[PDB]
């Protein structure tokens, strides 16, 4: 259930999730600069 938490440190789920979030902010940046 919480096995993710025992000895919380910080693979296929991350790098992917972590790449889109970057590909997403870069989008916000690219759009925002073009908005204002």
């Amino acid at each position: 259930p919480r096995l993710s938490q025992y000895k919380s440190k910080y693979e296929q789920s991350e790098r992917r999730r972590r790449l889109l979030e970057l590909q997403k902010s870069k989008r916000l940046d690219y759009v925002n600069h073009a908005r204002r």
């Binding site: 693979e11 989008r27 759009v31």
Partner: protein, 871 residues
């Protein structure tokens, strides 16, 4: 042959023979499904048939009405409902009468009854179901199997049916469940079925709980079942208390003290791990719920308004009694360790850690005694627990109360790193790391730093369960040291941090530990590189020459192995090569993002050159065709525009990745590259748009497949839009098609519903902002979308309705509102004020959860203002 013989053979081990039957029954369901299900239901109803046949027949009916794939499940239901109202009428009377006539334990009727219900209930097509199911459980003369199987049906119904369309009869469903759960019920099998049946039904008993009389009757029957002499039931009922506390917290004050308190701690104090596991959870959930409330109470106050829900601080009260039950359970370590086995011992640490964040200070005086009492116990079990407990409470008491204890705890901690038992040393590095993570000032000290740094370097050569932890301890230490150096030095990077004199020694050890053969155990490889990235990122500028060298070593490895992958012997080899590739590909994303920009270019010009050489040899198929497009993506960053040079030679590979739709996974990462290619080459991707936009529209034109994809190709259409401007006209046509149809999408495919709505929103913005202007001449392509403003606002209006609202969607929807105003100019105002829900969606966004969900929402009403003083 006879349906009876063909079914006894679907379970025949002879591969060839099994396929025969699976294709005979398969095609029989194509030619005439109505007839099929009537005959298959007859076979299930006849007690005289063989158990195998009967079960084989019911599994056939089950797989004609449901599946794991929601889109496919929603398809078998429509196909069923379109059948003759009488054919279905016979199927239902056999499937339903079957209950009680099955000597085999898991009934097949149940999962059929279930399958048909999820399809007929919504439309009131089976008015027999509920009163016949309730009748089978409450009738005094019902056999064990009859009550059991029927409750097994209701157990599946609530679990598989649309959560909404069942509240109407929540009255009937519940009277049959709690009847099965009644102490006077002779069978434990029935009780468990019912107790498990209630667990999946509480999600709509909201109308029933709002009534004292009943709620109280439910609570008693539940708590009474926590005393059943059948562990299976004991847990099941204890599971209910956990759920009941997360949905109906507002109620629990009446029962908490006089009952729940006694029940919860008795389980934690149990000798049975199953029961123990559920009682500890009970409290960490209370701890989670009373936290989620302290946030509500903190936000509502920042508005002055009363928080809709109030906390009753139950953990704070139970603190005294919980701590000794937790700290003592920490003592039951699992000698034969498994970082995949969930047990009370590990569960107890999380609860202590959570009890520390929830109540804060109060926790300290209750754990400290056990610590100082067991910190040097001759028996490690109490010694490890004395160190584990110490760590769990480092978060969420005042930093000005733990620092002195922590400082006064360092040397003993330092020693514990030389402990005879692996377990103690494993938990010691974690504690040290947490000490470095939460209260840095004690690690970065002119007293303990030198001996501490020495402790961790040796630790990298210890056992994987220690080595893996030490790495995090290092990285947490390095981040702090960096932060303690660049508080404010006027520039972006600091001059030198107190790990500058040891950096070179530190890095090479992590470069070695990365290749330790026992790397698969306890996630060493992954953690080892993860630490190197974090320690290279967080480093003093006078460590550069040491970061260059380290970067030359990582490139050298993405070669030793990246020509490995053009010579693969086995699928084992295939697998590990990619696991190494990935780890080097990701450790690459941070070394480039660190070295001089001038330097980061030459490294990229090399790796991309090698990736270009690897793509041609393995274009067909590819083990090396997934994480490679991800390595490409970052090389497409540390060149930006400069990537144009590569584009032509790489173009076809962007494509074979795009064409490969069977392995949607590659495809997903491929479609993302396109977006990044669009932002690196603004206005040079034009001679490539057209193949790509083609390969992408074909991808969506036919169903099949699978459908995480759709939402990311849509989002990218926007990226393309922005990048290629008035060249989008060609496709804008069919683009608003997929967009149009995808907004009308309807349904944990939630979470997917939101993800899809956000994609459309992001796309709409890309097209609008894409076809409008900066330093223009005049404007006006955008108005080609003008006829859609209506739908766009009306698709966003519906988003305002769904109580879902993932704060990401509110942002992109809010941001889109801004775009339309800037394009569409005060005709939009009349359309927005016509939908009051849009006003409410912007206000919800102006309240920050995630950041710049506020900024996009604060800016859309802003634009919707000075329209009011223009015309």
């Amino acid at each position: 042959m006879e349906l009876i013989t063909i079914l006894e053979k679907t379970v025949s081990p002879d591969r060839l023979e099994l396929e025969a039957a699976q294709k005979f029954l398969e095609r029989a369901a194509v030619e005439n499904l109505p007839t099929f299900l009537v005959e298959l239901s007859r076979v299930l109803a006849n007690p005289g048939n063989s158990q195998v046949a009967r079960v084989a027949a019911g599994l056939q009916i089950k797989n004609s009405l449901t599946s794991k794939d929601p889109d496919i499940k929603a398809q078998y239901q429509q196909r069923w409902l379109a059948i003759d109202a009488n054919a279905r009428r016979e199927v239902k009377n056999y499937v339903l009468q079957t209950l009680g006539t099955e000597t085999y334990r898991p009934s097949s009727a149940s999962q059929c009854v279930a399958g048909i219900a999820c399809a007929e209930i919504p439309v009131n097509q089976w008015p027999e179901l509920i009163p016949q199911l309730v009748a089978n459980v409450t009738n005094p003369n019902s056999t064990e199997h009859m009550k059991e199987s029927t409750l097994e049906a209701i157990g599946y119904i609530c679990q598989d049916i649309d959560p909404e369309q069942l509240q109407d009869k929540s009255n009937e469903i519940l009277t049959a469940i709690i009847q099965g759960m009644r102490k006077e019920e002779p069978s434990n099998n029935v009780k468990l079925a019912a107790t498990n049946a209630l667990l999946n039904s509480l999600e709509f008993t909201k109308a029933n709980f709002d009534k004292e009389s009943e709620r109280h009757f439910i609570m008693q029957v539940v708590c009474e079942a926590t005393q059943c002499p059948d562990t299976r039931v004991r847990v099941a009922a204890l599971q209910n208390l956990v759920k009941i506390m997360s949905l109906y917290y507002q109620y629990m004050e009446t029962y908490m003290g006089p009952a729940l308190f006694a029940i919860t701690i008795e389980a934690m104090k149990s000798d049975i791990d199953e029961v123990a596991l559920q009682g500890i959870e009970f409290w960490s959930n209370v701890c989670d719920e009373e936290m989620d409330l302290a946030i509500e109470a903190s936000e509502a106050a920042e508005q002055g308004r009363p928080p809709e829900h109030t906390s009753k601080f139950y953990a704070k009260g139970a603190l005294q009694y919980l701590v000794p039950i937790l700290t003592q359970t920490l003592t039951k370590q699992d000698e034969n360790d498994d970082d995949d086995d969930w047990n009370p011992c590990k569960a107890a640490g999380v609860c202590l850690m959570l009890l520390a964040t929830c109540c804060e200070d109060d926790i300290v005086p209750h754990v400290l005694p056990f610590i100082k009492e067991h910190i040097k116990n001759p028996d490690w079990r109490y010694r490890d627990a004395a160190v584990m407990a110490f760590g769990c409470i480092l978060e969420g008491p005042e930093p000005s109360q733990l620092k002195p204890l922590v400082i006064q705890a360092m040397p003993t901690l330092i020693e514990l790193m030389k402990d005879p038992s692996v377990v103690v040393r494993d938990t010691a590095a974690w504690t040290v790391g947490r000490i470095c993570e939460l209260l840095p000032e004690a690690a970065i000290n002119d007293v303990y730093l030198a001996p501490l740094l020495q402790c961790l370097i040796e630790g990298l050569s210890a056992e994987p369960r220690v080595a893996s932890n030490v790495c995090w301890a290092f990285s947490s230490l390095a981040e702090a040291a960096y932060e303690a150096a660049d508080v404010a030095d006027d520039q972006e990077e600091p001059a030198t941090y107190c790990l500058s004199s040891s950096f070179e020694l530190i890095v090479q050890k992590l470069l070695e530990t990365t290749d330790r053969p026992d790397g698969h155990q306890n996630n060493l490889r992954s953690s080892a590189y993860e630490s190197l990235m974090e320690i290279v990122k967080n480093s003093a500028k006078d460590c550069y020459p040491a970061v260059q060298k380290t970067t030359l070593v990582i490139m050298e490895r993405l070669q030793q192995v990246l020509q490995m992958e053009s010579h693969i012997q086995s699928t084992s080899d295939r697998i590990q090569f990619n696991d190494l590739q990935s780890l080097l590909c990701a450790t690459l994303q941070n070394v480039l993002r660190k070295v001089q920009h001038q330097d980061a270019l030459q490294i990229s010009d090399v790796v991309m050159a090698s990736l270009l050489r690897m793509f041609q040899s393995t274009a067909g198929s590819g083990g090396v065709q997934e994480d490679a497009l991800m390595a490409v993506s970052t090389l497409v960053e540390v060149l930006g525009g400069e990537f144009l040079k590569y584009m032509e030679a790489f173009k076809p590979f962007l494509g074979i990745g795009l064409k490969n739709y069977a392995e949607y996974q590659v495809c997903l990462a491929a479609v993302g590259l396109v977006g990044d290619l669009c932002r690196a080459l603004q206005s040079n991707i034009i001679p490539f748009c057209d193949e790509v936009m083609q390969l992408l529209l074909e991808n969506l034109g036919n169903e099949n497949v699978h459908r995480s994809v759709k939402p990311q190709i849509l989002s990218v259409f926007g990226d393309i839009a922005l990048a290629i401007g008035g060249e989008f006209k060609k496709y804008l046509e069919v683009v608003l098609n997929t967009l149009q149809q995808a907004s009308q999408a309807q349904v944990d495919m939630v979470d997917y519903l939101n993800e899809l709505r956000e994609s459309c929103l992001e796309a709409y913005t890309g097209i609008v902002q894409g076809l409008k202007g900066d330093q223009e001449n005049v404007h006006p392509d955008v108005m080609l979308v003008q006829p859609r403003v209506e739908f766009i606002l009306s698709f966003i209006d519906h988003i305002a309705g769904d109580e879902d609202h993932t704060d990401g969607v509110v942002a992109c929807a809010a941001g889109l509102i801004g775009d339309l105003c800037t394009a569409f100019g005060k005709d939009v105002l009349k359309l927005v004020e016509a939908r009051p829900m849009i006003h409410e969606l912007l206000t919800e966004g102006r309240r920050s959860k995630t950041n710049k969900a506020k900024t996009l929402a604060t800016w859309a009403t802003k634009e919707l203002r000075k329209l009011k003083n223009q015309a």
